[PDB]
Amino acid sequence: GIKLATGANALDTAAAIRAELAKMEPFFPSGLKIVYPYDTTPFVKISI
Amino acid sequence: TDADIAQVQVQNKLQLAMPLLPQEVQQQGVSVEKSSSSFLMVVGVINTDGTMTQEDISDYVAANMKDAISRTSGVGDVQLFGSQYAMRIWMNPNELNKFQLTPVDVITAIKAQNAQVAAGQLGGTPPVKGQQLNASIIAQTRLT
Amino acid sequence: MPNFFIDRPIFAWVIAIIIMLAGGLAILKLPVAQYPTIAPPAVTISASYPGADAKTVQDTVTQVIEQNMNGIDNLMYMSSNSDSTGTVQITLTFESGTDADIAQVQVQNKLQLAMPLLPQEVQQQGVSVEKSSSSFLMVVGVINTDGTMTQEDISDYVAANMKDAISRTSGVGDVQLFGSQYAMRIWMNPNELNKFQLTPVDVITAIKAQNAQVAAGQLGGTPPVKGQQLNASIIAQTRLTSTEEFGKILLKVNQDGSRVLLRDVAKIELGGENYDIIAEFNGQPASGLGIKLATGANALDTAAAIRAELAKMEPFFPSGLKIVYPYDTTPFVKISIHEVVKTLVEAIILVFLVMYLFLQNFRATLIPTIAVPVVLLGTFAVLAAFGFSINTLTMFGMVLAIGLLVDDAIVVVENVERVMAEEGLPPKEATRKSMGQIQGALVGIAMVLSAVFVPMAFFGGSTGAIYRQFSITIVSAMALSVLVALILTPALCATMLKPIAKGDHGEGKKGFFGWFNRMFEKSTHHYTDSVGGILRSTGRYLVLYLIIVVGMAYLFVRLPSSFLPDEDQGVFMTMVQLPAGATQERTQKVLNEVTHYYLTKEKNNVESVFAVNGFPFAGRGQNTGIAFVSLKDWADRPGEENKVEAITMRATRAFSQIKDAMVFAFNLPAIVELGTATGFDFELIDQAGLGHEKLTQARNQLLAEAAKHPDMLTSVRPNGLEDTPQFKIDIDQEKAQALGVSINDINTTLGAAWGGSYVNDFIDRGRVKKVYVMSEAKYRMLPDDIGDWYVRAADGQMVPFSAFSSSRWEYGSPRLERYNGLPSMEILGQAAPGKSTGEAMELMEQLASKLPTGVGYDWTGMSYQERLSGNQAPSLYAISLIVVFLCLAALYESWSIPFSVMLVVPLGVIGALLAATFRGLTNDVYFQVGLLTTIGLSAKNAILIVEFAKDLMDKEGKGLIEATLDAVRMRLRPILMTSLAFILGVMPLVISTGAGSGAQNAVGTGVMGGMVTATVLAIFFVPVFFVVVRRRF
Amino acid sequence: PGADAKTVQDTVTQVIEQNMNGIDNLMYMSSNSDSTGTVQITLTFESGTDADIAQVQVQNKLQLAMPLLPQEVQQQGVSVEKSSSSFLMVVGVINT
Amino acid sequence: EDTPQFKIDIDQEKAQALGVSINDINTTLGAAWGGSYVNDFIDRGRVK
Amino acid sequence: ERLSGNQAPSLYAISLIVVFLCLAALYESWSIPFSVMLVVPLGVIGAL
Amino acid sequence: LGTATGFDFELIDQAGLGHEKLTQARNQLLAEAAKHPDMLTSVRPNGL
Amino acid sequence: GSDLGKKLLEAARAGRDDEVRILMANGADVNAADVVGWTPLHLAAYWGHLEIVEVLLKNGADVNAYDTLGSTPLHLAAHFGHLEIVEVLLKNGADVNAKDDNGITPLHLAANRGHLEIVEVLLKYGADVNAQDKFGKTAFDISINNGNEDLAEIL
Ligand SMILES: CO[C@H]1/C=C/O[C@@]2(C)Oc3c(C)c(O)c4c(O)c(c(C=O)c(O)c4c3C2=O)NC(=O)/C(C)=C\C=C\[C@H](C)[C@H](O)[C@@H](C)[C@@H](O)[C@@H](C)[C@H](OC(C)=O)[C@@H]1C
Ligand SMILES: CCCCCCCCCCCCCCCCCCCC(=O)O[C@H](COC(=O)CCCCCCCCCCCCCC)COP(=O)(O)OCCN
Ligand SMILES: CCCCCCCCCCCCO[C@@H]1O[C@H](CO)[C@@H](O[C@H]2O[C@H](CO)[C@@H](O)[C@H](O)[C@H]2O)[C@H](O)[C@H]1O
Ligand SMILES: CCCCCCCCCCCCO[C@@H]1O[C@H](CO)[C@@H](O[C@H]2O[C@H](CO)[C@@H](O)[C@H](O)[C@H]2O)[C@H](O)[C@H]1O
Ligand SMILES: CCCCCCCCCC[N+](C)(C)[O-]
Ligand SMILES: CCCCCCCCCCCC
Ligand SMILES: CCCCCCCC
Ligand SMILES: CCCCCC
């Protein structure tokens, strides 16, 4: 459950989080998968 | 209000109250954060093979993913929707009373036998004239 | 605007006076430094666990602190290392442009909350949070010559009588003591302890109880009994002050009546806190003071104040104490400023001689002698407003811009002198006509030049910070030069210039000047006859131009790349690495031979040798040591053979004979926080909890695979230490419980005697110092001495260590590295000759994909910044060309004509590359910025030719060849004058041999060679570019 | 607590004062050492200085002196606050 | 101004001979003559 | 108070120069500002 | 910012009455708020 | 020491088979030991370099070489589960009942680490199952303290 820092950009932080998750993915155990059940940033990206 | 300065002011006052707080609270870790009230996003982690249980996934997420995400700029707070593994010692009061032992003896033996000891060195400084051996001494280490 | 200031010369003078006053005020209040803040903000958390191994420090201190480094803004990466000397260094590097005070306070606050999670020994020692900077203003050495003080005695005197006064000196930001102040050392004896049934635990218990501050209270304190007349504070037990008081500490009283004191079981003396470092300066004991320059402080003023403060302490120094200066950046800064000021004054003198050779009147020669210093002074006022500092980068930025500053003054004055000689107009009316011909061109030139240097400031990282210094300095000087040429110069030309008759071209004069005018007018006609013939066969010169473009493209690849040229700063390093497991005494034998080499074979060049045994570099163990060689002045070391590069290669070759010791010498970089060019900083991360031994095998696999490609990778070496043999001692819990020996008592006896235990504080001569309990050297060297330690059991019996312990030899790391919270192995290397850095990194990534499962990788430091700097490079070059084209399209009112000007770029670069290739110089930042000032000045000359040729076709209705031949004839004299003074102005920089010549040669050669071709080629190629472009379109 | 003015100055005041070097826009620094155990080091900065940034810079320099201070002083806690010498007002409370 | 102060010298040899702990001497002197802060309590809903 | 008095002469010196230069630029002359600046002592005598 | 018609009230204990007394005052207020459905709707505590 | 002798210690520790082979041809000292008393065979048995152990034993290396603490290469091969090296060393005359300065046999080290295959080879070569260390602990006493059910059946 990621909480955005005070004054930080929502889209820039979400992009940085996804870039960090990408570095972990090649070293995941058998069957491990990242899903996104809650994300407020795709709405900002699409509506704009 | 500059959130960086607001956190520094709150932290400065907390440092004064920290020694007054119980030792159990201090060892747990007091945190000061400048995060928003709502969740920016929730990064779910599942196992499509079924190899790992809910507890196993929660441990992997905390031990290999949480710390790096918490250090990411713009991330005020990270809430682990589970728990990192911990060496659980599940006491039995029937077995403890059988051998005349208490939870206090268990804590004492765990503190004494699960310890990372600074043993020193062989031929350490200031050394003698004519010393040829220099090696670190390795005493008890944290149990794995 | 020029017409407004032609009629109003006093207004123009008032503007120039204000610019001079603002520039003069800025010169006095501008901070002077060697180099500005270039490296990104880095914060280093340093902690100490006395007597602990690398794994103990990592698993109890490093991991805990790393786990709590969360919620900190603008963090890029976090490297850390735990070594066998009980030391951890957690460096957090932040994004460039982050408030370093905020970054440090955010790291410090997170460490304060993580503090209750660290061991009691680490909390007692304390953890310090500092700003990572190897940029010392100077290193002040304190030596003993009469052999009365040891290295610990000197360090104590400095800490209590010098450090505080040096810290309070004007402009001193930080003082680092290279040594340890006194510490009450309790050298325990196990034979004496066992005799009276005592253990190191009893020693610690007695010192803690008998050496402590006790709160007692008050006599007649509130609430008092009504009628109290006396109120006094009560003092009960204070901290001990002398060794005699520590020796008199009562441990126990025998049954017969005799007392057991601390002096009976231990040797009490005032020693040092840390004995791991042996510092020597020319064979005699020494201590140091790492002084750093404060933010916004003057380096030349601070160094003078430090020496003045040291002179005040001179009559108070003990017998034999001497102050030496092994490292000082101040003489380098003093020369870096003086050589710039010398070149700026020489340029004015040369411009005076060039103006008087052609124009031949003292009234004209005074105009650039006024305009140039006004522009130069004004640049300092803009630098002060932009928060900049007087440093090597900003000082050489003005030297590179001197060609643009003198050109603006020459272009205006010459045009007025030409209009007066061709029409006979009075100085005021001729200035209005002359300014009308070049005012639009000067404004257009300012826009084109802005489009060349402004995008250079938008680079990122350390490279971007270096380019920013040159961009702002050159853009500010160029903008003020155009402002002065449009405001001050037209006023000076209309009021100071002498009238010239129509037709008077100076040919009617007598003497040398009369001959020079007749020779120059004949050469001017010969120039037009040559240009006319060149315009008949333009096709031949188009092919000849393509040969120049091909030659430029070839020489660009065949030029070695670099950031800053390595200069003879006067000092160099010498690394001494003995085999894994060598003692401190064995490292001193090698250091003495290294010191003997510099004081015998190189005694004519070497001034002093700072042999620091156990230096923090390479795990700061007993098997490492450095030799900081300080040389004599550059005047006392003439020739290439007496320079750092030659001395280093001779020393490395001589030290190869020293067997069982890896001794090699190397020069220090221009900027310590840059490392090397064409080199990489790789990190081998453990992303699956594989372990240390598994990560070592993976590193060896990658290292062997890198060796299989010598054509792309060279010098791929790990930046860490190999596993060493360690003494694993196992305490049997069964035997310890059977005998009645406490486990804590065993670990305390083993830890305090073999590693040293920090008990508490004491007061030595009004100074708070540490108290350490440790075994005497005689009883803690070999595994046999383990069994000589007896621990008292609950029944009172003394049980030796050999009864409850078994020991074996095993391998373990003396330095564990961790990158971004995960275990890592840092790997250094560089690209092979001919291959780019991007090619070497790409191969490293390909070889990393073949490593075992769980072994990851990442780029750190210079590699991390080179990844993001290379992405911005194509866009910044493209924006420069687009804006340059657009500025010319608006000036000329054409979409095709701007191409004639843009074709002069390779004309100035071909000479710069030829001058650097024939000399042996590299493509450094001075050469890259010097290339832009050559391109800019050649385009400045081409703009004035194309503008004159177009206006002759548009207004006078002349033909293409007719107007082109007239334009080159008019612009021949101002082009020949600027080049003659600029080439002679940068001539002393090329021939600079001594002090700070590494930067002067890069600035000088890259400009002199470039200007020679950008003058000889442009005068014949520019008319071709204009004719070919206008015929094509 | 319980330490006299001489011990308080030698073990606490001097240690913090020697680390307050090179702070931006520093005018002067006055410090008191009470016989009770109180230490009060006031650092006055030039007019126009960001008082918040000044507090941050002082707090960073205090971190270097914190390890050398006694454990009894660290148990009380060291505070770094922005200071003013005079009272805006005094609000008295009486019981009629 | 300089104020007079009461200096007490605890004899370590005499205290150890009688069996009196130095920690108990320092606690007895400090708690009685200066006042010792033992712990906290709740006075009408507020920790004191 | 000490700083106020030390900067005082430098304050009057730059103010006189700025006014003089402003008058020279506005009225395009050297005699005009110089004759106007001679009136400063006539005012300062009354202020004192 | 809110939910347009929602309000956030805070019942404070300013006399050391205790938790049991504060609960009784909250219940009294909640009963009186229910008696006015024409103005106050969904008035409930945000605690356990 | 020697220039080639110290190079052999680094080659046997890293596992450079080609460097060891060239050093054998040039006459590098096989009985060269470091500060702690470890010969190239000790380092090869500790780091698990099977081919290097065979090359060293072929060039007359002391199979029963003991360090400053009485530990032999068989102790290191059995303690770190290098089954192939344990058999190679035992074939070349390694003392199966070798006791270090603590009275610990290679069987005690293999039993503590739980190496069933190594314990079986050791017992086959005649390892004393009733061997006691300095504390009187046999390999069976170690197996029951660790909780190795499979190892307790063998012992
Ligand atoms: C260009 O860089 C050079 C000098 C910079 O100038 C200085 C002033 O700036 C330094 C910085 C920015 C470091 O990070 C250093 C470093 O990490 C070192 C050592 C020393 O030891 C150093 O000496 C420095 C060092 C400097 O003197 N390595 C270590 O601590 C560790 C834990 C292991 C080292 C292992 C070997 C022995 C080492 O890898 C060796 C093979 C070389 O690669 C280096 C000595 C480089 O020499 C060369 C000539 O290539 C330097 C990094
Ligand atoms: C804190 C420390 C600060 C240190 C610096 C102090 C600041 C300096 C203050 C400014 C000083 C300027 C002095 C200028 C004097 C010029 C000579 C004056 C002669 C004069 O009065 O003739 C005027 C015009 O002169 C003319 O017609 C010819 C004059 C030509 C223009 C001026 C050229 C000389 C200026 C050189 C300045 C160099 C300054 C160096 C710092 C009057 O004639 P009118 O206009 O009343 O006519 C009326 C009919 N129409
Ligand atoms: C006129 C137009 C052209 C302008 C070019 C000239 C200005 C360029 C230099 C910038 C000013 C240099 O900065 C100024 O120099 C003086 C020396 O003269 C320095 O003065 C310092 O230098 C030396 C260093 O050993 C000391 O002996 C001296 O005690 C110390 O104060 C100061 O650090 C600074 O006040
Ligand atoms: C290594 C030695 C190099 C020699 C010097 C080269 C310097 C480079 C600067 C360019 C000088 C060009 O010099 C100039 O060339 C042109 C050729 O187009 C000559 O022009 C002459 O030959 C050309 C070609 O046959 C005719 O079209 C033209 O009618 C005729 O006048 C000029 O008479 C000469 O002055
Ligand atoms: C030196 C301070 C700025 C001076 C400004 C004065 C400008 C007045 C110009 C008046 N005029 C255009 C008529 O000459
Ligand atoms: C009378 C026409 C004069 C032409 C003025 C052109 C000014 C050039 C500036 C180009 C930058 C946008
Ligand atoms: C009519 C144009 C006047 C320009 C004045 C410039 C002042 C800096
Ligand atoms: C386009 C500007 C480039 C500057 C030199 C790298």
Author numbering:
A (entry chain A): 290 to 337
B (entry chain A): 98 to 241
C (entry chain B): 1 to 1033
D (entry chain C): 50 to 145
E (entry chain C): 722 to 769
F (entry chain C): 866 to 913
G (entry chain A): 674 to 721
H (entry chain D): 11 to 165
Lines quoted from the article behind this entry:
The E. coli AcrAB-TolC drug efflux pump contains the inner membrane H+/drug antiporter AcrB comprising three functionally interdependent protomers, cycling consecutively through the loose (L), tight (T) and open (O) state during cooperative catalysis. AcrB is the homotrimeric IM proton-motive force-driven H+/drug antiporter component which recognizes and actively transports multiple drugs (antibiotics, detergents, dyes, and solvents) via the tightly connected AcrA and TolC channels across the OM, leading to an observable resistance phenotype. Four different entry channels (CH1–CH4) have been described with putative entrances from the periplasm or the outer leaflet of the IM toward the two drug-binding pockets, the access pocket (AP) and deep binding pocket (DBP) inside the AcrB pump. Here, we present 13 X-ray structures of AcrB in intermediate states of the transport cycle.
High molecular weight (HMW) drugs such as erythromycin and rifampicin bind in the AP of the L protomer along the CH2 pathway. Based on this quite unique structural insight, we propose that HMW drugs like macrolides and ansamycins are initially captured in the AP of the L protomer (via CH2) where the switch loop accommodates their binding. During the L to T transition, the HMW drug accommodates in the AP/DBP region, mediated by the flexible switch loop of the T protomer, in an induced fit manner. The intermediate positions of the ansamycins observed in these structures appears to precede the binding to the DBP as has been shown for erythromycin in the MtrD homolog RND pump from Neisseria gonorrhoeae. Support for both the observed ansamycin and erythromycin binding and transport comes from substitutions of residues at and near the observed binding sites, which resulted in severe (Phe136, Phe615) or strong (Met575, Phe617, Thr676, and Glu826) increase in susceptibility towards ansamycins.
